Amino acid sequence: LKCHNTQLPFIYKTCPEGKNLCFKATLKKFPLKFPVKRGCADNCPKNSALLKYVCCSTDKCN
Amino acid sequence: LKCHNTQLPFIYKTCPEGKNLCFKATLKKFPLKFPVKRGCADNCPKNSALLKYVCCSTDKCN
User: Fold this and answer.
1) Which domain holds residue B1?
2) Does B47 touch chain A (CB under 8 A)?
3) Domain count of chain A?
4) Do B46 and A55 touch (CB under 8 A)?
5) Could you tell me the CATH number of the domain that includes residue A15?
6) Which of A26, A48, A49, B21 has the fewest CB atoms nearer than 10 Å to its CB?
7) Does B13 touch chain A (CB under 8 A)?
């Protein structure tokens, strides 16, 4: 799996063996053009106060 | 985990024991900002020919 791991569109890192989920963190209460976070995950992370998480299981899908 | 499981904004199910992801399938191509499939997921589904899938892990996040 390769995931997007910056805010920008062609930098991606190959995910460690545990990790099988790209996530993308997105500012909840105020709309933004670029994500706040992007990386690999083992378990898809729960939403918090500030940030809204969304995951997928496919190369370069975040 | 309660996920939306229908095409409409309210109806949700209690996800069966051991399905701790909600998913939302959208039409991969066009600007239909509304889901073609939602429900509970064991592992987050891969992208398909025509749908793009997307998972999250809090109640009713999909």
Assistant:
1) 1-62
2) yes
3) 1
4) no
5) 2.10.60.10
6) A49
7) no
